[PDB]
């Protein structure tokens, strides 16, 4: 099932540990707003691939942090 | 051994040349012989050739590295060198390392 | 060698490793070379990491340039399986849960 | 105005999107982003 003035903030955390890929997500109705949000686990995938680079597919703004 | 230009052929069976220094082996055995370039392929595991069958035999499961370099300058003379010998005729195929 | 470049188990791994001899089915008199093991890789694999890429391996200062060369080897080395081969060299099938 | 640069994954990445009409479609994760090495594709649509 799909994950889905700017009224939508989508927060995603991507982690690769032990060949398992972790996505944590929370969607907040709205510079990033100053607030506290905890991201619930969404799915974990056994990709088992080395990831060194990432790119974003675009058909607004996005924020990337390490 | 790799650095020297003459040792063009450094084929390793069941072993990695990169880790040769890293890996530790109880004993190393060196066998020295001269063969023509055409028959170099014969000296390989599970390979059948006249030299292999009756001169030097390698077992099918063999752990080691074979090093071959051209010896034209050293072994070729205007008169020619006939000292080297090969066993053309033998009653039975030689057992490995015999 | 397999642990470093093929399959790595995490140090904190919880599970069962199941192994049975497969000489009868996975070995042939002609020999089985379908099975492959990666002798050369630049770096040790992280736990549960799979590398399927086939690219020439450069172990020498001179560049391979996508061609076999001295110190340049195909990463995958085919296994040789024979019924004649003694135990310890016979094919073994392992399933890790 | 289109910005879609390749960004190093590093240890991990946090992605926040402010958007209307869900223009952002998804993410691609790979070592070298080519056929030679396996890559991960995530595409999200309605
Ligand atoms: C489980 C997994 O993907 N591990 C990879 C590892 O293989 C690679 O070496 C590193 C980047 O150097 O990124 C991480």
Curated annotation (Swiss-Prot), chain B:
Phenotype when changing residue 38 to N: In strain: Omicron/BA.2, Omicron/BA.2.12.1, Omicron/BA.2.75, Omicron/BA.4, Omicron/BA.5, Omicron/BQ.1.1, Omicron/XBB.1.5, Omicron/EG.5.1; complete loss of interaction with host integrins
Region (Immunodominant HLA epitope recognized by the CD8+): 81-89
SS bonds (residue pairs): 12-65
Superkingdom of origin organism: Viruses
Region (Integrin-binding motif): 36-38
Effect of mutating residue 41 to S: In strain: Omicron/BA.2, Omicron/BA.2.12.1, Omicron/BA.2.75, Omicron/BA.4, Omicron/BA.5, Omicron/BQ.1.1, Omicron/XBB.1.5, Omicron/EG.5.1
Function: Attaches the virion to the cell membrane by interacting with host receptor, initiating the infection. The major receptor is host ACE2. When S2/S2' has been cleaved, binding to the receptor triggers direct fusion at the cell membrane. When S2/S2' has not been cleaved, binding to the receptor results in internalization of the virus by endocytosis using host TFRC and GRM2 and leading to fusion of the virion membrane with the host endosomal membrane. Alternatively, may use NRP1/NRP2 and integrin as entry receptors.
Self-association state and partner proteins as the record states: Binds to host ACE2. RBD also interacts with the N-linked glycan on 'Asn-90' of ACE2. Cleavage of S generates a polybasic C-terminal sequence on S1 that binds to host Neuropilin-1 (NRP1) and Neuropilin-2 (NRP2) receptors. Interacts with host integrin alpha-5/beta-1 (ITGA5:ITGB1) and with ACE2 in complex with integrin alpha-5/beta-1 (ITGA5:ITGB1). May interact via cytoplasmic c-terminus with M protein. May interact (via N-terminus) with host bilirubin and biliverdin, thereby preventing antibody binding to the SARS-CoV-2 spike NTD via an allosteric mechanism.
Protein name: Spike protein S1
Organism name: Severe acute respiratory syndrome coronavirus 2
Gene name per UniProt: S
Residues of the full protein shown: 368 to 465 of 1273
From Swiss-Prot, chain D:
Effect caused by changing residue 44 to Q: Partial loss of biliverdin affinity
Glycosylation sites: 45
SUBUNIT field: Binds to host ACE2. RBD also interacts with the N-linked glycan on 'Asn-90' of ACE2. Cleavage of S generates a polybasic C-terminal sequence on S1 that binds to host Neuropilin-1 (NRP1) and Neuropilin-2 (NRP2) receptors. Interacts with host integrin alpha-5/beta-1 (ITGA5:ITGB1) and with ACE2 in complex with integrin alpha-5/beta-1 (ITGA5:ITGB1). May interact via cytoplasmic c-terminus with M protein. May interact (via N-terminus) with host bilirubin and biliverdin, thereby preventing antibody binding to the SARS-CoV-2 spike NTD via an allosteric mechanism.
Function, in words: Attaches the virion to the cell membrane by interacting with host receptor, initiating the infection. The major receptor is host ACE2. When S2/S2' has been cleaved, binding to the receptor triggers direct fusion at the cell membrane. When S2/S2' has not been cleaved, binding to the receptor results in internalization of the virus by endocytosis using host TFRC and GRM2 and leading to fusion of the virion membrane with the host endosomal membrane. Alternatively, may use NRP1/NRP2 and integrin as entry receptors.
Protein name, per record: Spike protein S1
Provenance organism: Severe acute respiratory syndrome coronavirus 2 (2019-nCoV)
Gene name as annotated: S
């Amino acid at each position: 099932q799909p994950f889905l003035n700017f009224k939508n903030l989508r927060e995603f955390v991507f982690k690769n540990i032990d060949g398992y890929f972790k996505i944590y997500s929370k969607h907040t109705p709205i510079d990033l707003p100053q607030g506290f949000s905890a991201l619930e686990p969404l799915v974990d995938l056994p990709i088992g691939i080395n990831i060194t680079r990432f790119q974003t597919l675009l058909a607004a703004a996005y924020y990337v942090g390490y | 051994l790799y650095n020297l230009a003459p040792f063009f052929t450094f084929k390793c069976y069941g072993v990695s040349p990169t880790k040769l220094n890293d890996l530790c082996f109880t004993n190393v055995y060196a066998d020295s012989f001269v063969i023509r370039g055409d028959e170099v392929r014969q000296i390989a595991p599970g390979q059948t050739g006249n030299i292999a069958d009756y001169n030097y035999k390698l077992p099918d499961d063999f752990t080691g590295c074979v090093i071959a370099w051209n010896s034209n300058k050293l072994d070729s003379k205007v008169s020619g060198n006939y000292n080297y010998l090969y066993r053309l005729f033998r009653k039975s195929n030689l057992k490995p390392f015999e | 060698n397999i642990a470093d470049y093929n399959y790595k188990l995490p140090d904190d791994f919880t599970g069962c490793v199941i192994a049975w001899n497969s000489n009868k089915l996975d070995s042939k008199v002609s020999g089985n070379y379908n099975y492959l093991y990666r002798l050369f890789r630049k770096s040790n694999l992280k736990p549960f990491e799979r590398d399927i890429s086939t690219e020439i391996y450069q172990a020498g200062n001179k560049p391979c340039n996508g061609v076999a060369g001295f110190n340049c080897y195909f990463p995958l080395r085919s296994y040789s399986f024979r019924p004649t081969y003694g135990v310890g060299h016979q094919p073994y099938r392992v399933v890790v849960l | 105005r289109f910005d879609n640069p390749v960004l190093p994954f590093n240890d991990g990445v946090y992605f926040a999107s402010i958007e209307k009409s869900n223009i952002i479609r998804g993410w691609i994760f790979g070592t070298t982003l080519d056929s030679k090495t396996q890559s991960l594709l995530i595409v999200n649509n309605a």
